Amino acid sequence: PLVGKYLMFTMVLVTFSIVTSVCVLNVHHRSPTTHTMAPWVKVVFLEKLPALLFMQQPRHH
Amino acid sequence: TRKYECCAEIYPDITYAFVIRRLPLFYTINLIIPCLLISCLTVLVFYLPSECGEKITLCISVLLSLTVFLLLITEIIPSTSLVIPLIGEYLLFTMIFVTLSIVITVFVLNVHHRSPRTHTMPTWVRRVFLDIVPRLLLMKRPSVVDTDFERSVKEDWKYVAMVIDRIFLWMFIIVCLLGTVGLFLPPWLA
């Protein structure tokens, strides 16, 4: 059934989202005491991607 | 033709053998794929940080879902003790290792929330889990000098918990991959 196929597709996507959310939570709870941020991470995720996604880190400091 | 102890004569018979193959799409979609999707989440608990306060939720949900699917399979197959379905063995082994993961998660959460006011870190723990294992696991702790003793030991306990999680993240991934292939690959080869 098409409804069953659509439900299966959404279940696969939700499993993907669970994995991604685990990874995001791992990233969020990082601090200098435990992890050191590589300069490439800095560049990409604080300058390039935010500009593409229209986020504009305030960067007041 | 064959003789029966009832009677002295030979009684013939014709026996028909119906060799029938199941079309697996329906049960594939309805059982196999959901089970694999749940199986994809068995090791995720070891990558969740202890501060998220949701490790228990995830591992418990995985355990209960696997148990429910095992119960669903049980209602389909005959209750015979001569053979064991491969799906049943896979689900049972996954449930066992998920239970083990829950036990390890409780231990790791206990280790994470230790402080000088309640626990004392042995020298051997410090040595092993702050020098040796992190090196073998390719994780490099920043060289930070915290002046507050109480806040620094709390951060050492939090780092020791991360290392224990990473060890079991590696073991469970190896076991998960080796076990799955070691169970289903040989049958698919003839």
Curated annotation (Swiss-Prot), chain A:
Family in the record: Belongs to the ligand-gated ion channel (TC 1.A.9) family. Acetylcholine receptor (TC 1.A.9.1) subfamily. Beta-2/CHRNB2 sub-subfamily.
Clinical note on disease: Epilepsy, nocturnal frontal lobe, 3: An autosomal dominant focal epilepsy characterized by nocturnal seizures with hyperkinetic automatisms and poorly organized stereotyped movements.
Subcellular localization, as worded in the UniProt entry: Synaptic cell membrane; Cell membrane
Role summary: Component of neuronal acetylcholine receptors (nAChRs) that function as pentameric, ligand-gated cation channels with high calcium permeability among other activities. nAChRs are excitatory neurotrasnmitter receptors formed by a collection of nAChR subunits known to mediate synaptic transmission in the nervous system and the neuromuscular junction. Each nAchR subunit confers differential attributes to channel properties, including activation, deactivation and desensitization kinetics, pH sensitivity, cation permeability, and binding to allosteric modulators.
Transmembrane domains' residue ranges: 3-27
Oligomer and partners: Neuronal AChR is a heteropentamer composed of two different types of subunits: alpha and beta. CHRNB2/Beta-2 subunit can be combined to CHRNA2/alpha-2, CHRNA3/alpha-3 or CHRNA4/alpha-4, CHRNA5/alpha-5, CHRNA6/alpha-6 and CHRNB3/beta-3 to give rise to functional receptors. CHRNA2:CHRNB2 and CHRNA4:CHRNB2 nAChR complexes exist in two subtypes: LS (low agonist sensitivity) with a (CHRNA2/4)3:(CHRNB2)2 and HS (high agonist sensitivity) with a (CHRNA2/4)2:(CHRNB2)3 stoichiometry; the subtypes differ in their subunit binding interfaces which are involved in ligand binding.
UniProt protein name: Neuronal acetylcholine receptor subunit beta-2
Curated annotation (Swiss-Prot), chain B:
Domain of life: Eukaryota
Annotated lipid attachment (S-palmitoyl cysteine): 52
Transmembrane segments: 31-50, 56-72, 87-111, 167-185
Effect of residue 75 to K: Loss of CA(2+) permeability
Intracellular or extracellular location(s): Synaptic cell membrane; Cell membrane
Cystine bridges: 6-7
Variant or mutagenesis effect after changing residue 5 to A: Loss of CHRNA4:CHRNB2 channel opening potentiation by divalent cations
Coiled coil: none
Similarity-based family: Belongs to the ligand-gated ion channel (TC 1.A.9) family. Acetylcholine receptor (TC 1.A.9.1) subfamily. Alpha-4/CHRNA4 sub-subfamily.
Subunit structure as annotated in this protein's UniProt entry: Neuronal AChR is composed of two different types of subunits: alpha and beta. CHRNA4 forms heteropentameric neuronal acetylcholine receptors with CHRNB2 and CHRNB4, as well as CHRNA5 and CHRNB3 as accesory subunits. Found in two major stoichiometric forms, LS (low agonist sensitivity): (CHRNA4)3:(CHRNB2)2 and HS (high agonist sensitivity): (CHRNA4)2:(CHRNB2)3, the two stoichiometric forms differ in their unitary conductance, calcium permeability, ACh sensitivity and potentiation by divalent cation. Cells produce predominantly an (CHRNA4)3:(CHRNB2)2 nAChR.
Disease: Epilepsy, nocturnal frontal lobe, 1: An autosomal dominant focal epilepsy characterized by nocturnal seizures with hyperkinetic automatisms and poorly organized stereotyped movements.
Function per UniProt: Component of neuronal acetylcholine receptors (nAChRs) that function as pentameric, ligand-gated cation channels with high calcium permeability among other activities. nAChRs are excitatory neurotrasnmitter receptors formed by a collection of nAChR subunits known to mediate synaptic transmission in the nervous system and the neuromuscular junction. Each nAchR subunit confers differential attributes to channel properties, including activation, deactivation and desensitization kinetics, pH sensitivity, cation permeability, and binding to allosteric modulators.
Protein name listed in UniProt: Neuronal acetylcholine receptor subunit alpha-4
Source species of the chain: Homo sapiens
Taxonomic lineage: Eukaryota, Metazoa, Chordata, Craniata, Vertebrata
Encoding gene (name): CHRNA4
